[PDB]
């Protein structure tokens, strides 16, 4: 194939892909159906 | 030339005699500390004369 | 810029002046007899108490009265405080005629504030 | 001239100033277990041989520089330390001659060419 | 409303504490390239 | 009890006194290797 | 060709500084890039604090921690804790946020582009971590400047406006302090007090003049300790009582910063003079006395006589007596019988809370502070929840006395961890078994049997 | 600033600027011109 | 300065009122400002020997460490005992004029 | 809302503004 | 005060240009010669523009 790309680079974008979907959950405690607001 | 217990603790305070800093030395450090001291003596002479009277000094017998 | 204090003085500022006028006629009291005879820390009761409410009360000349004469009216209200700093801190001096002339200063500024600003 | 109704000299070598990060004069270190010796415990007749040697350590260094060969330093120093081991301190000589070297190469900071010559020649005096 | 006539920068200066946390995680990312 | 207080106050200053110039006399030279 | 690697220095990607122990050039770039980062939080947290601020709501309600640090020096505070000009809080952070780029330029020059060692380059800056005259000159350069910061608060005090006083007559006010306490019998005598309740060794420092007398005596010995370490060496006993390496100097300091933040986790919990309650919030010792006081004077309006009534349990419901004679507030408030805040100091009589002046001399300002301080007790949730844990989350206030007191205690205890864990490696640095015991000459097989 | 301090401070300006610097420049910039001869 | 006139380990100097009536002994506070320079304020005399003593300390701490220059040692003839005596008497006369004055 | 997305714009500009200093060094050949 | 948009809006886009271009210049030794000066025109623009938002703070 020889299309290999440095893992470290996709270690960031998978890591901040993990970070935005657990950062969205802590946004969701503060508006929505469980927020007591 | 009599050694005592006293004189074997002060002879390093009086071991040298003519050891001297080199030529012209730390003279103008002493000069600018003198010129600050004469200006300080000139200030306090006219504090007391009331000729460099300031606010809230009033050199007088109304004091503590 | 508002001249007409219809309810603005008659409910607020004529109760602003009324509460510290009420401490004022009382003030020839035990407090003068404290500095006459012999009670050191009940003056510090009075300075942070009945004179603690003479000053935290006398604080909203900003928040109710005439913002052109506001910056000249701060330091009128600051000199009444800062002379009464000498009243409570001459209690550790233990000599009650440095505090007695400090109390006579509170005649020169409190009623001079009360003579001023009917607006 | 005895007298002492006006004059007496000496000293100099102290705390004046300077900020410089230049002129690396091979830094001198003290050997461990060294203390500076007092003159009163040492003796005035014992130190008058001592202080003339300190001029004599550089007087032969000035002789060897114009001689163009460090042989006269490297032949009048071998076993001088084991001669003076009884009287003088061996540790006091190394720290004196090192700062004699370092202060001399500080005087040669302007020429930039003979300073590395005397650094070769003073190092013969230290290593011998 | 802290500023006098800035007033559109209430978005940008709200996040400005959080960037020292981002300075630590960048040191992992810089180390993820070369060194291991 | 004030008679007791000094007796307790001696023995704290004795034991802490024999801790504070315990370490002050070489305490990095009985570390069984170099400079022991 | 690379300074950093696994097998040239024996350190991995973690323990990710210890390549910089002997390398002196980029170690300066480590700290100045880090000191740019501390100033970067120091401006921007305040620049986030303002524009999340409103001036008419009180300071502690929003959960904000640096705006009450600025209000101690009185940067536009009129009287009683209301603010009048927020632009003095705008200038102080932007002189740190703009200064963080200038501090950031140095720590990125020396860590990348600058030299790797400087002993050769300057001869002033360079060190070995063994040259004992040069290493004490480094401390002497900072102590003369740390004394200059210590006289910097008192030069703000005695000349430029003044420091805020919570013991001002009329609630609280800024005032220019005209006599700091120079007598050492009281202020060095604070060090010789008991660290328990009652005496309050470094914590109970009422009459703000004693704090501003402190930084007279702090900076005038920090100057005097600054010029000592320029001129002289450590002593002969000091050469053989310490570890002299690149390590332990962090660990001597990490022992101190752990000790300093235990004190910082007690200045912000108990003291009501250096940290004012009208900016930071009331203490636990303040709010429990504020709980009983508004229920005392509530009773006065009702008219039941205070002294006669016996609580639910035999004691006085309102005014019982403490173990040493001060008539104090009753109930569960016997623990905080040492409460000396600014309100109810006009209720302190000769003995304590005197009942001649506890009746007929409560003021409407006096109760409404304690009414506010009752409901603003330090009682938090994790998130924003306030009040008792059992109570529903109707309103939010974490009371940043409490919310900053535990946050240093996370870091005060953690700095005791690493200080102990560097003191192991530093003592094994000079002893040579930082990598473990030997195969051949094991020292315990030389030891005799038990 | 007080009206007798600055009236004293103008002397320390003028007693410097009229007496001292025209003595110092008025001596050393004529003695350095007429240097004495040591070679005999 | 500090350990005798300020009440730390000692009783203070004499201080009275103006128009001297109730003059007694109490420890005076060292006043550091310009108000301590008028000699009728006793707060300068406590602030005297603290401030003159600390520069008396920093003189003699300096004066042990350095040596005089040879452009002064041959000029002031500092090896001689007599020169020092002359200097001392001259200084003393200066000190006797002020307590003739004050 | 207008100045909520410009907040999260100013997030999403500034987070990956970090690692674009790293990849630009790691592909031009700068010594990392 | 409509100038106080475009001055500080130019500051936030030129200081975003300094979070990224300064480790590039510092990072590469080979291209350092070209870039060494470019910081003194880089930061020298950023210095006098932070000075110019300072005087325009007080003027409005
Ligand atoms: C295995 C799995 C485990 C790991 C899973 C991944 C989790 C990673 C770690 C957790 C990270 C937290 C997520 C961030 C979201 C968040 O938390 O978000 C919460 C807040 C931001 O949310 C805001 O929080 C505010 C908090 O109230 C504040 O404001 C209120 C309204 O004004 C009140 O006034 C109140 O007084 C004041 O506290 C309000 O709730 C706002 O509505 C809300 O927008 O994040 C902040 O600020 C955080 C502050 C930043 C620095 C933290 C400093 C902490 C110092 C104290 C530490 C001591 C020990 C604590 C023990 C725990
Ligand atoms: C050695 C080990 C020390 C710790 C052992 C327990 C000591 C008790 C303690 O911890 O107590 C901490 C003490 C201070 O104790 C508190 O000190 C207070 C002083 O506040 C006084 O002054 C304040 C002014 O703001 C308020 O007015 C307050 O109401 C008023 O009482 C009172 O004395 C309290 O009774 C008392 O709880 O020392 C301090 O600050 C510093 C404590 C250092 C150790 C910290 C460990 C956590
Ligand atoms: C002034 C503080 C200070 C300084 C300058 C140092 C300096 C040093 N430490 Mg050290 N340390 C300190 C305090 C300090 N220590 C304290 C207080 C602790 C206890 C916690 C430690 C614990 C520690 C360990 C555990 C060891 C060192 C080591 C080292 C050396 C190598 C550093 C390294 O590679 O980092 C490595 C950095 C990391 C691996 C990053 C770790 C990230 C942590 C786990 C994050 C924790 C959570 C954090 C708060 C973020 C939370 C975010 C939130 C949203 C969840 C270096 C000399 C090493 C050594 O012996 O070398 C001499 C060693 O192995 N340190
Ligand atoms: C406070 C945090 C901090 C700081 C200041 C440093 C600083 C440093 N570390 Mg380090 N480190 C840290 C945390 C930190 N570290 C942590 C938590 C870990 C554990 C993961 C490590 C692990 C680690 C290792 C293992 C090593 C270092 C090394 C270094 C040094 C040289 C780095 C180098 O040459 O690459 C330079 C970096 C680059 C060229 C990459 C580009 C990245 C840029 C420069 C980041 C900054 C950009 C910034 C946003 C722009 C500023 C704007 C400007 C206007 C001011 C440097 C002094 C190395 C060393 O000892 O030196 C040889 C080394 O081997 N560190
Ligand atoms: C802890 C801080 C610190 C320390 C110890 C050093 C130390 C050093 N730097 Mg340096 N530097 C720093 C911070 C620091 N820097 C910062 C923050 C920057 C970014 C602006 C720089 C930028 C920098 C450059 C660009 C260079 C150095 C160089 C040097 C070295 C030579 C010293 C010299 O010739 O200066 C001579 C000293 C002066 C000319 C005096 C200047 C003093 C300042 C600017 C005046 C203001 C003082 C201030 C008011 C004091 C109060 C501080 C207060 C604001 C907190 C020296 C090792 C040089 C180097 O590495 O060698 C090639 C070099 O080229 N530095
Ligand atoms: C924080 C700044 C700082 C730092 C890091 C140092 C660091 C140092 N100083 Mg130093 N110094 C400083 C400020 C500082 N100094 C100031 C401000 C002054 C002026 C007063 C001095 C005056 C000074 C002199 C006069 C001497 C030093 C010495 C020393 C060296 C060894 C310290 C030692 O063994 O004593 C540690 C102290 C002890 C072992 C004694 C025990 C102390 C107590 C009883 C232990 C228990 C304390 C307890 C936990 C807390 C209660 C406090 C109180 C209520 C008792 C070290 C390099 C010594 C040295 O080497 O000479 C240069 C030395 O003789 N310093
Ligand atoms: C332990 C020593 C000691 C003590 C505590 C006293 C105590 C006292 N003596 Mg006394 N005395 C002593 C030793 C002592 N004496 C000795 C050894 C002598 C013989 C020289 C005398 C001779 C003596 C006389 C003749 C008299 C006293 C008197 C007194 C009383 C008042 C002192 C006074 O007015 O100050 C006045 C002191 C001074 C003005 C000090 C002069 C120093 C000048 C101002 C400065 C000199 C320049 C300075 C050294 C250099 C600059 C320093 C600068 C860098 C800081 C006082 C009770 C008086 C008395 O009758 O009491 C019974 C009195 O008349 N003393
Ligand atoms: C890619 C590969 C991934 C592999 C994962 C494999 C499965 C792993 C499953 C483990 C996680 C189980 C818990 C799920 C978390 C969750 O659902 O949160 C989902 C919740 C739900 O969020 C809620 O949504 C509601 C919607 O109306 C409400 O609005 C609420 O306000 C909101 O909070 O969000 C959170 O709890 C945030 C915290 C997340 C952190 C939880 C960590 C738990 C760790 C437990 C220990 C397990 C070990 C893990 C580490 C190894
Ligand atoms: C866990 C981990 C991970 C992950 C990570 C992440 C998820 C992230 C990272 C990182 C990052 C992501 C970082 C960031 C950074 C950033 C930065 C570094 C920044 C800079 C900037 C600045 C500092 C700013 C500036 C400014 C200002 C000041 C204001 C205005 C605006 C501007 C822009 C101008 C991985 C797996 C990979 C590896 C392992 C570890
Ligand atoms: C103004 C002020 C004040 C006052 C005063 C002061 C400032 C003081 C200081 C003081 C001090 C000054 C203290 C100190 C301390 C010390 C310490 C803390 C030390 C420690 C150390 C240690 C503990 C160690 C030891 C050791 C050991 C054990 C071993 C070895 C040997 C040795 C010795 C080293 C106050 C507080 C009121 C408040 C505010 C400020
Ligand atoms: C390094 C030396 C320090 C120089 C500064 C010295 C400051 C002055 C020291 C005396 C301090 C104040 O002096 C005295 O303090 C005591 C303390 O009980 C009070 O009593 C006195 O009323 C006051 O006169
Ligand atoms: Ca913002």
């Amino acid at each position: 194939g020889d299309a290999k790309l440095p893992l470290w680079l996709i270690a960031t974008v998978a890591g901040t892909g993990v970070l935005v979907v657990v950062g969205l959950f802590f946004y969701g405690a503060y508006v929505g159906v469980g927020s007591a607001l | 030339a009599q050694r005592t217990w006293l004189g074997d603790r002060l002879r390093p305070l009086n071991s040298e005699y003519g050891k001297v800093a080199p030529g012209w030395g730390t003279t103008p450090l002493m000069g600018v500390f003198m010129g600050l001291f004469f200006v300080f003596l000139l200030i306090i002479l006219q504090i007391y004369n009331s000729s460099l009277i300031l606010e809230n000094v009033s050199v007088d017998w109304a004091n503590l | 810029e508002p001249p007409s204090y219809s309810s603005i003085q008659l409910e607020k500022i004529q109760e602003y002046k009324s509460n510290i006028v009420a401490i004022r006629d009382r003030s020839t009291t035990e407090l003068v007899s404290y500095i006459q005879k012999g009670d050191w820390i009940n003056i510090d009761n009075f300075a942070h108490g009945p004179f603690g409410t003479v000053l935290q009360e006398m604080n909203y000349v900003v928040r109710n009265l005439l913002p052109n004469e506001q910056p000249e009216a701060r330091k009128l209200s600051r000199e009444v405080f800062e002379h009464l700093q000498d009243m409570s801190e001459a209690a550790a001096k233990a000599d009650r005629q440095q505090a007695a002339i400090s109390y006579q200063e509170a005649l020169k500024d409190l009623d001079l504030f009360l003579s001023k600003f009917p607006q | 001239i005895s007298y002492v109704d006006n004059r007496g000299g000496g000293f100099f070598d102290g705390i004046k100033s300077l900020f410089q990060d230049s002129g690396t004069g091979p830094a001198v270190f003290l050997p461990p277990g060294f203390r500076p010796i007092n003159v009163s415990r040492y003796g005035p007749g014992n130190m008058t041989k001592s202080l003339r040697d300190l001029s004599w350590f550089l007087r032969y260094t000035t002789y060897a520089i114009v001689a163009g060969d460090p042989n006269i330093i490297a032949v009048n120093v071998r076993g001088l330390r084991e001669i003076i081991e009884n009287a003088c301190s061996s540790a006091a000589t190394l720290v004196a001659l090192q700062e004699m070297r370092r202060s001399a190469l500080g005087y040669l900071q302007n020429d930039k060419e003979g300073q590395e010559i005397a650094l070769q020649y003073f190092n013969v005096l230290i290593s011998e | 409303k802290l500023p006098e006539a800035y007033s559109i920068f209430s978005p940008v200066v709200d996040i400005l504490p959080v960037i020292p946390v981002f300075f630590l995680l960048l040191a992992f990312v810089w180390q993820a390239a070369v060194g291991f | 009890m004030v008679t007791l207080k000094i007796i307790v106050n001696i023995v704290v200053l004795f034991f802490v006194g024999l801790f504070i110039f315990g370490f002050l006399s070489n305490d990095p030279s009985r570390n069984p290797k170099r400079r022991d | 060709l690379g300074g950093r690697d696994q097998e040239s220095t024996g350190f991995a990607w973690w323990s990710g500084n210890a390549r910089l122990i002997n390398l002196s050039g980029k170690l300066l770039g480590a700290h100045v890039a880090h000191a740019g980062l501390i100033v970067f939080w120091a401006g921007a947290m305040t620049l986030f604090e303002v524009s999340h601020f409103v001036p008419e709501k009180p300071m502690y309600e929003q959960g904000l921690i640096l705006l009450p640090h600025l209000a101690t020096q009185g940067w536009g505070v009129g009287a009683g804790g209301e603010v009048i000009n927020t632009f003095p809080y705008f200038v102080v952070g932007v002189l740190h946020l703009i200064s963080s780029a200038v501090l950031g330029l140095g720590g990125i020059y020396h860590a990348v582009r600058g030299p790797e060692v400087l002993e050769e380059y300057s001869s002033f800056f360079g060190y070995d971590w063994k040259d004992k005259n040069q290493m004490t000159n480094i401390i002497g350069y900072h102590l003369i400047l740390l004394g200059c910061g210590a006289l910097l608060l008192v030069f703000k005090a005695m000349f430029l406006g003044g420091v805020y006083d919570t013991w001002a007559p009329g609630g609280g006010d800024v005032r220019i302090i005209n006599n700091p306490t120079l007598n050492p019998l009281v202020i060095f005598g604070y060090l010789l007090k008991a660290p328990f309740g009652g005496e309050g060794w470094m914590i109970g420092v009422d009459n703000m003049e004693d704090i501003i007398g402190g930084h007279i005596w702090i900076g005038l010995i920090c100057i005097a300790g600054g010029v000592w370490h320029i001129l002289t060496k450590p002593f002969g006993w000091a050469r053989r009582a310490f570890i002299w390496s690149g390590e332990a100097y962090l660990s001597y300091s990490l022992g101190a910063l752990s000790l300093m933040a235990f004190i910082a986790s007690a200045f912000v919990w108990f003291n009501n003079t250096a940290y004012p309650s009208e900016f930071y919030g009331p203490t636990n010792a303040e709010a429990s006395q504020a709980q009983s006081f508004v229920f005392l004077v509530r009773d006065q309006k009702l008219g039941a006589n205070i002294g006669s009534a016996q609580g639910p349990t035999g004691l006085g419901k309102y005014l019982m007596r403490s173990p040493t004679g001060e008539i104090i507030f009753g109930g569960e408030t016997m623990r905080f019988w040492d409460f000396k805040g600014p309100w109810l100091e006009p209720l302190r009589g000769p003995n304590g809370l005197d009942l001649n002046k506890l009746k007929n001399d409560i003021q409407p300002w006096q109760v409404r502070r304690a009414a506010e301080y009752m409901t603003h007790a330090p009682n938090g949730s994790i998130n924003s929840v306030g009040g008792i844990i059992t109570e529903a989350q109707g309103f939010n206030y974490v009371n940043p006395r409490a919310w900053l007191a535990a946050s240093h205690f996370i870091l005060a205890f953690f700095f005791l961890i690493g200080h102990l864990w560097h003191a192991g490696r530093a003592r094994a640095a000079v002893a040579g078994f930082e990598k473990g015991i030997d195969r051949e000459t094991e020292p315990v097989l030389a030891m005799p049997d038990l | 600033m007080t009206p007798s301090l600055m009236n004293f401070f103008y002397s320390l300006l003028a007693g410097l600027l009229i007496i001292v610097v025209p003595a110092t420049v008025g001596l050393i910039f004529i003695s350095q011109k007429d240097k004495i001869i040591r070679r005999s | 300065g500090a350990f005798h006139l300020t009440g730390l380990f000692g009783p203070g100097m004499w201080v009275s009122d103006p128009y001297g009536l109730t003059g007694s002994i109490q420890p005076v506070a060292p006043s550091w400002g310009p108000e301590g320079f008028n000699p009728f304020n006793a707060g300068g005399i406590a602030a005297h020997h603290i401030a003159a003593g600390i520069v008396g300390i920093i003189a003699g701490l300096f004066h042990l460490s350095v040596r005089p220059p040879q452009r002064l040692y041959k000029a002031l003839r500092m090896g001689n005992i007599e020169t020092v005596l002359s200097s001392s008497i001259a200084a003393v006369f200066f000190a006797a004029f002020v307590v003739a004055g004050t | 809302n207008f100045e909520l997305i410009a907040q999260l714009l100013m997030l999403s500009l500034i987070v990956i503004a970090g690692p674009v200093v790293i990849v630009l060094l790691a592909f031009r050949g700068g010594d990392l | 005060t409509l100038l106080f948009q475009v001055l500080l809006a130019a500051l936030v886009i030129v200081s975003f240009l300094m979070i990224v271009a300064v480790p590039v210049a510092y990072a590469s030794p080979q291209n350092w010669s070209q870039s060494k000066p470019l910081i003194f025109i880089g930061s020298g623009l950023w210095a006098v523009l932070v000075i110019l938002v300072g005087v325009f703070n007080y003027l409005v």
Side-chain angles (χ1 to χ4, degrees), chain B residues 3 8 11 15 17-18 20 22, chain D residues 4 8-10 40-41:
Chain B
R3 296 177 67 187
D8 278 349
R11 148 77 48 187
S15 261
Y17 175 66
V20 56
Chain D
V4 93
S40 63
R41 205 56 56 199

Side-chain angles (χ1 to χ4, degrees), chain G residues 386-434:
Chain G
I388 321 74
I389 299 169
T390 89
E391 195 174 293
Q393 68 346 283
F395 105 129
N396 57 346
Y397 126 111
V398 51
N399 196 357
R401 289 291 282 265
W403 176 235
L404 189 143
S407 83
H408 293 290
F409 212 83
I410 304 297
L411 310 166
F413 166 67
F414 277 174
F415 266 51
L416 189 144
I417 294 279
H419 152 66
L420 179 60
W421 175 105
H422 283 299
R425 210 207 176 268
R427 188 82 62 160
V430 284
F433 40 79
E434 73 266 28

Side-chain angles (χ1 to χ4, degrees), chain G residues 195-198 200 203-204 262-263 266 270-273 338-341 409:
Chain G
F196 290 91
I203 305 301
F262 286 136
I263 303 304
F270 289 115
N271 184 268
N272 215 337
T273 316
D338 213 357
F339 171 62
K340 208 207 288 293
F409 212 83

Side-chain angles (χ1 to χ4, degrees), chain G residues 146-294:
Chain G
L146 214 66
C148 284
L151 55 95
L152 174 56
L153 184 65
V154 309
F155 281 6
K156 162 71 184 79
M158 259 67 71
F159 299 97
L160 286 81
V163 186
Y164 190 75
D165 207 321
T166 189
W167 297 101
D173 207 331
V174 72
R175 66 184 186 100
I176 164 165
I177 290 191
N178 266 325
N179 49 345
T181 319
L182 309 153
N183 45 86
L185 204 353
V186 61
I187 180 160
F188 260 75
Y190 282 149
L191 301 152
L192 278 299
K193 300 224 290 173
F196 290 91
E199 291 87 345
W201 154 76
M202 268 323 279
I203 305 301
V205 210
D206 60 57
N207 292 319
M208 170 58 82
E209 273 186 18
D210 284 349
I211 295 109
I212 215 70
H215 313 137
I216 301 307
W217 279 100
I218 287 306
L220 266 296
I221 73 164
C222 275
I223 281 175
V227 290
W228 195 23
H229 283 208
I230 302 307
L231 293 202
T232 58
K233 319 180 282 173
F235 279 167
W237 58 271
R239 285 211 316 242
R240 60 175 61 87
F242 288 86
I243 308 184
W244 294 77
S245 315
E247 217 63 35
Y249 292 177
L250 257 288
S251 182
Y252 298 146
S253 297
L254 251 67
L257 313 176
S258 46
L259 175 58
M260 270 186 214
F262 286 136
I263 303 304
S265 282
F267 261 125
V268 74
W269 189 252
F270 289 115
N271 184 268
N272 215 337
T273 316
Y275 291 141
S277 63
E278 51 266 20
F279 301 132
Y280 284 92
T283 84
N284 197 240
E286 180 146 23
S288 192
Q289 309 292 320
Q291 175 202 34
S292 80
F293 173 65
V294 67

Side-chain angles (χ1 to χ4, degrees), chain A residues 11 15-16, chain E residues 16 19 22-23 25-26 29, chain G residues 40, chain J residues 15 18, chain K residues 12 15-16 19:
Chain A
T16 185
Chain E
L16 260 291
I19 306 168
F22 290 156
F23 263 95
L25 292 131
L26 178 105
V29 170
Chain G
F40 196 85
Chain J
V15 23
Chain K
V12 68
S15 50
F16 172 88
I19 199 177

